[PDB]
Structures are given as structure tokens and as C-alpha cells.
């Protein structure tokens, strides 16, 4: 939290560490490694699950590798398994596509003790309510 | 393109286009494009403009066209003497006096109706101005 000094995010899912197909060559280049992308990967990946996507810091000064404490899996990641489709768009607005509910995704994004906006926690409730409306589902609030 | 589907006679005396225009009020839509000058609009003219505006607004709102050709214009081709009969109708025009509302429109933002009319205007041989509907 100072300025620009290393940080990116190009992955797929925590249940396959280091992937070469989607991100490939561009995950280790500037004091960052395509091999070491697993040690601090599983410093607490499996400790919870290998079924949720998560990007992370990098932080570099010229040192051998890089230190990058992590945080949340997004809230668009938790609409494939826990709140409907696995495609997402469908036909986003020609027809309502799919539906959800206020209870669904409440706790799934209320757990966020490492991200969110709204001292009032009912606020960052509706401040996750849209990563489901980004695919124009249906309001079963 | 516009033209009479049929007419009592093939050709008209050239005539003159004196006078001020009947049909001077935006009387069908919210906005109009009004003739400020005198002259002839030709069907291609009317149509070129009509397209211009229609596409500006896309499949939105509605349009009316107040003027309609009905005046047949003949010409003589090259390499022909004078006389030997009145020439052959080649196209149609509408006589436009100053004041004529030409096209009306509604179902769109004023600003858009302006843009749209600005564009159609450029296709027209005569000066025009933006007008608006009025009580009374």
C-alpha cells in the first residue's frame, strides 16, 4: 500500500496450481517464478479448498522471488457452484436466464473478512448483490 | 421515391413559384424541418434526406413527410433542335415556397431530432430551419 511495485492477476481456479494452458509464460518474469508459483500457493490453498478462483499480490524489490499474502475469492466465482448456472451469460437479457434469492450469496460474501465496503454489513450485502445481476439473473430478494 | 401513382395529364406548364407557403406549422409530430427558401425539391432529393434522418434516429420514433412531388419535369436530350414537341418527363418535384414544413418527427429527444434534421438538410437544395410544435 504505497505505489506501483509489482502486482498482477491471471489465473483460473485454486484446484489447479500454476496452469500453463491459460496464463502460461506470463506468470513468472520479474522476480516471479513459474515454479515457485505453488509454494506460497499452497501456504493455505488446500487448507480450505481447491474449488474457488483467487488472484493475489506480488510485491517485489529485486529479491530472488516474491512475497504475496492473499485474500478473497471473488463473488462472480461463487455463482457457478452455489447460485445457478456455470455458463453465466446465457442470453443475458432476452429472457431472465436464471434466478437466485437474497439468502443465496449473503453468507457466501458476508464471510468476506478480507474485502468489502460498508461498515453497515447490510450494505456490502447489496454490494455483492450485483455480481449476480452482472449476468441479469432474477430478483428473488 | 415519391411520385403520383397516376395523373390526369402527362406534362405541366412550367409555371412560376411565387408566394408564401401553406402548411407552416408542425402539425403531426413534435419537431419539423422548415423551408426558409424558395425552390424545387426532387424525389431523389426528398428521399436522400428522408434516409439521412431516418437512419440518424434508427428504428426509433416516427416521421412524416409533408411535401410530395406531383410536378412532372420534362427535358430535351442532347443533339435535338428546339421544338418538335414538349420533351419527355424525366422526374418529379415539389414546388417549395418559404415557410413550408417539409418533414416532421416525434418519439425522439429534441437534440436527436435536431441532429437528424441537420443531416437531412445537407441533402437539400434549399435553406431550412429547425422548428417546434406550438400551442396556438
Amino acid at each position: 500500500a504505497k505505489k506501483v511495485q509489482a502486482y498482477v492477476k491471471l489465473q483460473v481456479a485454486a484446484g489447479m496450481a500454476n496452469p500453463s494452458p491459460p496464463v502460461g509464460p506470463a506468470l513468472g518474469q520479474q522476480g516471479v517464478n513459474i515454479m515457485e508459483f505453488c509454494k506460497a500457493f499452497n501456504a493455505k490453498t488446500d487448507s480450505i479448498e481447491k474449488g474457488l478462483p483467487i488472484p493475489v499480490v506480488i510485491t517485489v524489490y529485486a529479491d530472488r522471488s516474491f512475497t504475496f499474502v492473499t485474500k478473497t475469492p471473488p463473488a462472480a466465482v461463487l455463482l457457478k457452484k452455489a447460485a445457478g448456472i456455470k455458463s453465466g451469460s446465457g442470453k443475458p437479457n432476452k429472457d431472465k436466464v436464471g434466478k437466485i434469492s437474497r439468502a443465496q450469496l449473503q453468507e457466501i460474501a458476508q464471510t468476506k473478512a478480507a474485502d468489502m465496503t460498508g461498515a453497515d454489513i447490510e450494505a456490502m450485502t447489496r454490494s455483492i448483490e450485483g455480481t449476480a445481476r452482472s449476468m441479469g439473473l432474477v430478483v428473488e430478494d | 421515391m415519391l411520385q403520383p401513382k397516376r395523373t390526369k395529364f402527362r406534362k405541366m406548364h412550367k409555371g412560376r413559384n411565387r408566394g408564401l407557403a401553406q402548411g407552416t406549422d408542425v402539425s403531426f409530430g413534435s419537431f419539423g424541418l422548415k423551408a426558409v427558401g424558395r425552390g424545387r425539391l426532387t424525389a431523389r432529393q426528398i428521399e436522400a434526406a428522408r434516409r439521412a434522418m431516418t437512419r440518424a434516429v434508427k428504428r426509433q420514433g416516427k416521421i412524416w413527410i409533408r411535401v410530395f412531388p406531383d410536378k412532372p419535369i420534362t427535358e430535351k436530350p442532347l443533339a435535338v433542335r428546339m421544338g418538335k414537341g414538349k420533351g419527355n418527363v424525366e422526374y418529379w418535384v415539389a414546388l417549395i415556397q418559404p415557410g413550408k414544413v417539409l418533414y416532421e418527427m416525434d418519439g425522439v429527444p429534441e437534440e436527436l431530432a435536431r441532429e437528424a434534421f441537420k443531416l437531412a438538410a445537407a441533402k437539400l437544395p434549399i435553406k431550412t430551419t429547425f422548428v417546434t410544435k406550438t400551442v396556438m
Partner: protein
Amino acid sequence: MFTINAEVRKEQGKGASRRLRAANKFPAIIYGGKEAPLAIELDHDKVMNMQAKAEFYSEVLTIVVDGKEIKVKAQDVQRHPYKPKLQHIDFVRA
């Protein structure tokens, strides 16, 4: 509440009304009631902006000719053929 000032017309017909408009006043008229109609002359700019507000055509306006106050409603306009301006107005004394 709409207040229009007006002299009466010392002369009439085409020549005079043209001369009026040339001078940025235009002619108008008042009638209805049992009184005779009144050949009126209004200043252009002032009456113009007034009639821009729709209320002008619905409200009862008050015309003012030498001191006296006439209560009227706009009955008809004759606008210019293509310019933002008025050529004539009918007022209904009501």
C-alpha cells in the same frame, strides 16, 4: 398576471401594419363582448418572450391601453412564415 402594454392604432391597413413590424412593433386586435373591437399595437420583443411560456395561451392576460386595463385570453396568432416572430394576434375580451 401576464401584463401586456399597448397603444391603440392611429392608422390601419397593410401599409401601416407593415410599417409597424418594420419598427419592431406588431399590430393586434381585441374583440368579443359588447364593446367594439380595438385596433391595438404591441411591442414585439416583450410580447414575444411572453408567448414563449405556454401559460400565455391558457391564462387570462391583461392588456393595458392608455391607463385602462382589459382582461383577455389569447385567441389566435399569425406567426412569421419562417422566423421566430409574430405578425398578428387576436385577443378575446373575456
